[PDB]
Amino acid sequence: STGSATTTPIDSLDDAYITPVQIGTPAQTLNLDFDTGSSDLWVFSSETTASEVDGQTIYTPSKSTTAKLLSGATWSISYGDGSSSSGDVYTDTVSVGGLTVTGQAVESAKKVSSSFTEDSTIDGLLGLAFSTLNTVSPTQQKTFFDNAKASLDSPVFTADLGYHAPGTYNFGFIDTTAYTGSITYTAVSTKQGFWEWTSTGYAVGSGTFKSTSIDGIADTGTTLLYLPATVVSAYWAQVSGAKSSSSVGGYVFPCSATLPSFTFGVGSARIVIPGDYIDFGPISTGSSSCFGGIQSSAGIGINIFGDVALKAAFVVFNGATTPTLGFASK
Ligand SMILES: NCCN1CCOCC1
């Protein structure tokens, strides 16, 4: 079997991507944020505290004839961005672009933090990292990908995020018309439960490529590109007037600048992120200072190849016996 769904940026800056997901019987369609950096499928629901819901579509388990309450199971998650959510668990039929999983754990939110409430376009998350990070207690649950894997024509899912435009998440197959050249596969460590790999280096604009190992995670759930302070300082030093602002919480640059591109290595191959992809608009409405798309990971503890980097490539999340990541230009 296979699945294919369109993913769309929630706003003019590509702050996040939403993909329609069918849950329950009859189908309840919610727009979820596909997250390769987490492993919980959670939704805003009829049980979420009323004051914590503002515009989101909710899952009502009581209206689903296939929903079964998972006895005594609870979930609670805290993300790297300080956001959190928690609640109870149901098992239900979940479909992504024609691909169906029966008995998927659907984590119904009883509580969400303000960051989730203020994002009216995001009805919940769909975790695509390894099932070892799933927060369901006392019995850990599997991801949608993990549940569908055996049935898939090939044990893979692909992320093809668009820049200011719709994209695609495919399950079970590789669309050879969706990229140029070849896909370069690279080793993955699943020890931290992430699609963790090692980039072979970088280049800023037309500059000389620096061969250096950068360990990081392929994370569709993170908007920006988080890299070591040395690399990020080398990038912003090419932008006239750019500086790291402690009040804003990162590198900012004059909105009138044309940004240089950023290249990252995947083995001997290179993925070029165009400069416009690194522009995240005014720091505040009407400001002439803009927020940078490449930020230091010094406060995080891990490098994150978020949407800024992933949207420049066709990305294969290969869930074979030994998982690997594949990258191609497009
Ligand atoms: N609610 C602040 C965070 N969110 C995260 C996803 O994009 C929009 C902004």
Side-chain angles (χ1 to χ4, degrees), residues 1-62 64-141 143-148 150-190 192-242 244-330:
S1 66
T2 64
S4 186
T6 297
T7 195
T8 50
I10 64 166
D11 63 18
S12 64
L13 301 172
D14 300 347
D15 277 319
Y17 295 81
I18 51 168
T19 314
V21 181
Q22 277 68 56
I23 310 175
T25 311
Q28 297 186 40
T29 299
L30 270 71
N31 297 332
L32 307 184
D33 186 345
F34 284 27
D35 186 9
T36 66
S38 76
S39 310
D40 286 45
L41 196 182
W42 76 258
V43 292
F44 275 78
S45 69
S46 58
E47 312 167 331
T48 312
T49 304
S51 66
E52 303 177 3
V53 179
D54 179 18
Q56 296 84 4
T57 295
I58 64 182
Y59 166 56
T60 305
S62 72
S64 175
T65 62
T66 43
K68 298 180 179 20
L69 181 67
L70 186 61
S71 189
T74 60
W75 64 277
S76 185
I77 191 165
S78 288
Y79 297 96
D81 68 351
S83 70
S84 65
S85 48
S86 66
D88 56 8
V89 189
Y90 286 85
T91 63
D92 213 341
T93 306
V94 173
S95 290
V96 180
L99 174 73
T100 300
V101 166
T102 54
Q104 170 68 41
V106 177
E107 304 166 35
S108 167
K110 283 189 159 237
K111 303 290 173 304
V112 304
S113 68
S114 57
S115 187
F116 291 115
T117 301
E118 52 186 59
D119 295 346
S120 77
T121 60
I122 301 169
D123 304 327
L125 265 64
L126 195 149
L128 296 165
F130 297 92
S131 298
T132 57
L133 296 171
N134 184 263
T135 78
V136 182
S137 182
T139 307
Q140 262 196 319
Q141 304 294 306
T143 70
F144 174 80
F145 179 50
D146 247 18
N147 283 330
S151 305
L152 293 177
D153 294 350
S154 181
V156 299
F157 73 89
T158 71
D160 175 14
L161 310 179
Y163 164 69
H164 291 349
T168 308
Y169 275 100
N170 284 332
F171 290 88
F173 76 104
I174 285 156
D175 182 3
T176 61
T177 68
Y179 60 89
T180 65
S182 75
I183 306 175
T184 294
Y185 292 84
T186 197
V188 167
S189 173
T190 74
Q192 296 182 65
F194 301 124
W195 288 97
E196 186 168 357
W197 65 289
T198 301
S199 176
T200 49
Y202 73 92
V204 177
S206 70
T208 39
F209 182 90
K210 175 74 179 177
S211 292
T212 182
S213 296
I214 306 165
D215 290 339
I217 66 179
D219 183 6
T220 68
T222 293
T223 310
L224 307 184
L225 172 51
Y226 294 88
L227 290 175
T230 51
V231 180
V232 176
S233 184
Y235 179 78
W236 291 109
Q238 296 306 312
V239 183
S240 182
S244 190
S245 161
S246 76
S247 65
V248 178
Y251 279 93
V252 301
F253 69 94
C255 294
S256 60
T258 296
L259 304 176
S261 65
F262 188 87
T263 299
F264 67 92
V266 181
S268 64
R270 308 286 181 251
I271 301 300
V272 182
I273 301 168
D276 287 0
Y277 286 34
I278 305 163
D279 180 351
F280 274 76
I283 62 172
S284 289
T285 310
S287 176
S288 74
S289 309
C290 274
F291 196 63
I294 295 169
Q295 299 294 346
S296 185
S297 65
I300 305 161
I302 207 176
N303 300 310
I304 309 164
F305 287 89
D307 300 334
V308 164
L310 305 182
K311 79 167 96 174
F314 175 85
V315 196
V316 180
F317 293 79
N318 177 22
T321 299
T322 294
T324 71
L325 262 180
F327 287 85
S329 292
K330 64 188 191 192

